[PDB]
Amino acid sequence: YDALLLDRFLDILQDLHGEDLRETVQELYEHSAEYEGKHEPKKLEELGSVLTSLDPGDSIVIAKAFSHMLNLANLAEEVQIAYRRRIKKSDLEETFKKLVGDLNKSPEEIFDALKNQTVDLVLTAHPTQSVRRSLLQKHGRIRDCLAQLYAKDITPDDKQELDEALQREIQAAFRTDEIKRTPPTPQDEMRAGMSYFHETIWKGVPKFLRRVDTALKNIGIEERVPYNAPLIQFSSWMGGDRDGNPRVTPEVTRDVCLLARMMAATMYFNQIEDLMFEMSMWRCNDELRARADEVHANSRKDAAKHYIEFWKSIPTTEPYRVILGDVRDKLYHTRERAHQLLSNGHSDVPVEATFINLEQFLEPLELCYRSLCSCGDRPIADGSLLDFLRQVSTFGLSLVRLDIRQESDRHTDVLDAITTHLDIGSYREWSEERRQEWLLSELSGKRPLFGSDLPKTEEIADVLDTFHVIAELPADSFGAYIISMATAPSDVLAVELLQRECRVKQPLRVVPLFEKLADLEAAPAAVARLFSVDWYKNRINGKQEVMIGYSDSGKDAGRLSAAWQLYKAQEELVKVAKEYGVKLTMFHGRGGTVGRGGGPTHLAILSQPPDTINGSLRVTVQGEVIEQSFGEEHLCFRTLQRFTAATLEHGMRPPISPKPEWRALLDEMAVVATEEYRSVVFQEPRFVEYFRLATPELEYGRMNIGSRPGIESLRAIPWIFAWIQTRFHLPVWLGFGSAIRHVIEKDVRNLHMLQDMYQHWPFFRVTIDLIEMVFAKGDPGIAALYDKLLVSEELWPFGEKLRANFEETKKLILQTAGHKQRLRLRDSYITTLNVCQAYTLKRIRDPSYHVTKPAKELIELNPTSEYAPGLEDTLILTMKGIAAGLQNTG
Amino acid sequence: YDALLLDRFLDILQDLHGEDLRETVQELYEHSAEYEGKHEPKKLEELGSVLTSLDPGDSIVIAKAFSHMLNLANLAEEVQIAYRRRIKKSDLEETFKKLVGDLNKSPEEIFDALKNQTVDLVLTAHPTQSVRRSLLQKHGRIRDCLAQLYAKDITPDDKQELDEALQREIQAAFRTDEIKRTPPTPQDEMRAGMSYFHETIWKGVPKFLRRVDTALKNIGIEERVPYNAPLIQFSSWMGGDRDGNPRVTPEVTRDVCLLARMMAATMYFNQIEDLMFEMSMWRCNDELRARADEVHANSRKDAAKHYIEFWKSIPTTEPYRVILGDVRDKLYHTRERAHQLLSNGHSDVPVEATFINLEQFLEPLELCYRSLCSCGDRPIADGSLLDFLRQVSTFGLSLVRLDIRQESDRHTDVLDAITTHLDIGSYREWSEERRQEWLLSELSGKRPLFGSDLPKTEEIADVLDTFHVIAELPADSFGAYIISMATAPSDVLAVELLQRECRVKQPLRVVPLFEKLADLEAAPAAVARLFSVDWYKNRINGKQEVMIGYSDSGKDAGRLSAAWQLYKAQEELVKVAKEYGVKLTMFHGRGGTVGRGGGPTHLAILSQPPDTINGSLRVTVQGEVIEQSFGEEHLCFRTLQRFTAATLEHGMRPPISPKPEWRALLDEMAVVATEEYRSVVFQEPRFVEYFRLATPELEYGRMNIGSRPGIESLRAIPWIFAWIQTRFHLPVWLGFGSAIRHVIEKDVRNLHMLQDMYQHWPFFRVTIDLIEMVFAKGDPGIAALYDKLLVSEELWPFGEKLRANFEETKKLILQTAGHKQRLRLRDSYITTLNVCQAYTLKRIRDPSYHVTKPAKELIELNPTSEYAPGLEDTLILTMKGIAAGLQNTG
């Protein structure tokens, strides 16, 4: 069946570029097959020799071919998973059954805990989505065709039309330039993010809630999940995160907020007419009767011809239609107002004519539900009206609440400008004590701080203006203000003061971001010191959120030491919050790749310390993971399923707490791991030199994914990207070798204790299992090829040293997990691209192949390329394709 | 499986009204089962005795129950047909194969004939749709649930959720008042009609064309049906037909025209963004390159924030996106202009900013298609772009072209006002010759006729103002001007002159309506006399359309005589048109019921005389038939399939022409039939008396279906309705008895000639077979019950006489067809309603049961009822239910 895609695609490839190129692709496929089979490292050079002959356009077409074959492989994989799972006629029903049988927990305990559980998924525009949106659509159509094909209810003509359809959709995908020729704007990122709503999430949330209702009824709970129960919520960073991104201006935040508001209004308006058509009952309570009579009083006996349906005044015979008719009016004016507010700078639509409250909207629909239930129509109410109720109470008036993130030093610059202009000192030079006392005196004082005549920099005015934009916009449009590089209470209080001083009517909650290992070590102390400030603890209202970054932790220290320190951090933060009677919810800045704290969602949630969630979880979805977990109905459902199940289990089934021997053992193990990591990534003075040559790191910025314009000083995303492209995975497994070897060296029974830990401690089991997965996607022969082709003859053995540790570390991993279904084949395509990526890099770093109208062929697609005509496009294509094959970018 | 619906519905009925009423419904079902089985006429009285006991509310609930059970039976029937047809893995592919094998016709002949073939389906608001739209939606949801259930890919939870869904949707249907409490406005009729577009037709037309493409490729024709080839078109009467309907004012026509235009604009706008996303190619011709460069010149470097997607200026890298971007702009302004024009009386949107031409729209899309084909992307072009092309060239800027219909006497009144005010005579008193000469002198003259100071009646001003409204609106928004009761060329020329004189820039074609038998007899002579007028034949441009009514023909004369005269009419009209070298297209005013010329569509088309269509057909779809043939994807497809196949076959496979012995035989047979018909329906002086008592005719107007406020002087719709409710079908079979008996009496070999005619002449075969179908839906015991319960003891034998002829006629029908799968059961429910309808009529026509806030029970739903509280609702419910069971209203 794997041969099917090969057949169809290669047929189209021959129909587009001839037999010769299809035969050369087939040769490359056969060489790569002999490599992923026999594993002879000579086969790689045998393949590269064939790759050198390729013309400038032909090499482009080859990279194109293997890239699209990898994409098709991903789509067929998704179809086969969805069907293989569907033909069974963790999981929600299974989780409920296990919670009842195993742990003796009762249905009402599961229902009660589930009512009070919340999962806040926040989508980010982190530049990890390699495939452009113009192609993502075509992939969606192709997986639709393949899903409809993988079935036994095909009527011959339908199958033929799907053949023509899949053929034309592949041809259309292959006929689009996969290369972003300009990087996006932040608004473009926010559109790419929100597109999953008016395509999947909007209908996916009500369906998922209905399924939860079904499961609860399969445990004996006739009751239904409350429509206003917040089981899942959505936040966004798109247009809000300005940390290190000067292109995210205040006008950008205004733009994305108004945008989201207009989208929400449009969706509700499209729904409301069909809902009005269904609510055709004539029985209601005395309550809904009285209200509908009120609306019919001010019914405006007018033509009302701007609508299509129900343009005549709605009779009181159908009262639900009266009330929903008023909801439609306020929806129409809400949409038109947001449309003008966005299109121009203003609107004449009266605010009283729109929905201003989150639940001015909800009130009439709630009334309809009470009416239907009182009159015996609970089945009807639990249908489209319940779907709509859940959509309102889940998406509100602005589809997603927007977070604003900014580094602490920018707030410090602002305050320093304020104290210098006020002739009271320099806030920068002040100690922490002084900053705290001053900020407190101003927060509790009543006199304004700065004035119109405060001297501002473009940066200072940037942050002040973002605060004014926050003040001008509705409160329910924003989420949290996240402080990057937050270290002291003065960093939070600075934001509270700048908010209050910028006349932010309803100030949003402040949340610190601890991402570097040093900040994670000292985080509980800082949070405790903040809660010690009685003013802040009294204004925090017993609830605090703090963000815990995962990207940078495993970059400066070992991955093992980073994970372990993260566990300690969560644990002691909960300790502090409990010590101050504050409900702490922790915001996990997880990635898609294990190197940035990624991995399977339920495994990541299981590897959290116990009693640290408590029905309140907040997780990032890094750009590319959005597509991974919401591009199809089934994907979206499996996502919300996975999250809510893992949280509920982690609430009622607490993971085992580590034995103290395991605590000290992991402390020692972490020390050895960190020394082993920094030994090779920072102590070696030639390491950065070898890295900038053996990996395609430097070229990452050429993909133009995001809108953001030594090794310690680079972003973690291209850091993981470099070692995953080469399939070496250094940042995933580095410290583990020396760690384990030292732990068995110091004591031989520590082997029995490692075996003991892998079979009982969820955190350790998940860590080791992830490392094993990452090893299963690794092949050191690739890194060997990159060294042989791109690294100078001098420090060739350096890489070999690494190659040693790799295998050594792998030997230890399987030794702890106790290990020694036949997918493979895709690694063949990937291998070809690996070779193509290596040789092309060699031709890129040369002088001869450097530079000293319309387009009718691929080579004319890059006229402003500093490198040779056909080369740059080929390199970008190789990166895209390899990322697709590995199902991860960074 | 029939028991399934009974189970589910009766479960809900018990959950809504208790065991007692469910048991009484079950008793009624069992009595009706013993009646439709044993056929004992005592069982009917046995059932009515049970019906008399019912409380006022309970009888309402019983009629409700059997009505909804009949509706569910219809839906299950539709599902079972669609699946039973789908599990085969006339018809298009079969028709092609037969045209090749049987008749030796070649593929290019079928393709050429199919290119030049047109089928114009015109939807009417004729008051035959008994079920209100508020309930029609619920039926749609219920058939969706039942369709998804009738399958073997159900995953347990999906099946349970569909159980809850179908339960709540039945409960919602049963919880709506099925009774229209006020009759609709014409605009409401036009909305009900157009709703099938933005639900089924809009996506159904491209799919159907794709299927035709598939069939053509299965004959070896790689070519595709031209996007602009007009295989199917849609016209409307909703808001245009004012014949006898004073509520269809000129403002109504303006309203429905602007409405339709705004709907079309909205649909195109919703499509255009997704089409823009797909057309992401970068290769184009020099032509499309030059045009896209033109658009990028006047690109308006602006924010363009009113859009959601593509708000940035579209780069020339993707030229299809540039051009489709301009199409989107003109679509946005077209929609906004029509929206303001409708909402207010005017718009500030410049006309140059919108699409004014039918193919100003088409030009850029045509260019995109030429580009894709030239660059090798014909597969891509034959996808969404082809779907969109076909939708544009099929629906245009206003979804349907509107017809205006008006009776001739109103034009005559206008002209008489004009000649009297001009002091030149009285146009009424003028002979035909004089009217022709005068009208010709004015049409060819250049001086204006009437002025501002012409004295007008409300009627005269009605028609003049409809002409001004026609002049004010775009030409492509209107279809034809149909003249009711048209008898002379002066009737057509009057409309041509009134149009020209009301400054109708592009005057619409005039078409006469011959519906009464007298007018059909003299139609060819009148058309020939019209073509004799050289001025009109020179302005007609070789094309003429004439309408042929079917409703009134079978009302004043026999059904057989009516059908036969219709055949003669078509035949001699074609003779005249060929004699004048005019391409005649005939407009068949067919109904849904056989009594109004209804029946299966392919059978009606086959019963047309040969060489009378010639790739040009125009057929009405009477109100209720719209729902019958477009309420589901499958129904819509089977409809367009049936029509286009029947027309193509009737073009290449001409039906046999009648032998002259059959001509004279049918002439005699028609004379005997007409005398037999008028003998009982007009000669009998007590006939009208017996009719107004034995049938529920008089109560028809109580259903409030349409917006239109002796027996010769009633409408044909309630005429067929009365005899189908009682299941007697008098107007379908009346003349056939005496006709056949006289034909075998005059000559015994005429029996062998009838046997000869039934096996070779398609018109006769269809006629007899239809009569046999109508007999299969008849039961004279019902009419016997109505007589026994409602007809005075005096003329009881009169009905029995009719009952005699019934059986007698039936004996003859099966004797000609040579006749002597087990659905039945539904006739049980119908029978119950029959009984309920009879006894209730008896209680309605009494003095004791006559009349001399909110609502919380069914009896309070009618507070202004002249009859007893619970009675009127029960009668209306019985009519609705019986019509549903018989699948026909009138």
How far from one another are the termini of chain A? 31 Å
Helix segment count of chain A? 38
Largest interface: A-B, 65 and 65 residues
What topology, given as strand order, has the largest sheet of chain A?
Answer: 1-2-3-4-5-6-7-8
Number of strands of chain A: 8
- CA gyration radius of chain A, whole angstroms: 29 Å
Biggest sheet architecture of chain A: 8 strands, parallel, barrel
- Shape, per Cα inertia axes of chain A: globular
Oligomer: part of a larger assembly
What structural class results from the helix and strand content of chain A? mainly alpha
Summarize the structure.
Chains A, B: The modification Phosphoserine is found at residue 657. Chain A has 890 residues and is mainly alpha-helical. Chain A is 61% helix and 6% strand.
Written overview of the protein:
The PDB classes it as plant protein. This is part of a larger assembly, with two copies of chain A (890 residues). Chain A has 38 helices and eight strands. In chain A, helix 2 runs antiparallel to helix 3 (42-52), helix 4 crosses helix 7 (133-149) and helix 35 runs parallel beside helix 37 (826-844). In chain A, strand 7, helix 25 and strand 8 (616-622) form a beta-alpha-beta unit. The radius of gyration of chain A is 29 Å and the shape is globular. The two termini of chain A are 31 Å apart. The first copy, chain A, is mainly alpha-helical. At the A-B interface, helix 7, helix 8, helix 9, helix 10 and helix 11 of A face helix 7, helix 8, helix 9, helix 10 and helix 11 of B.
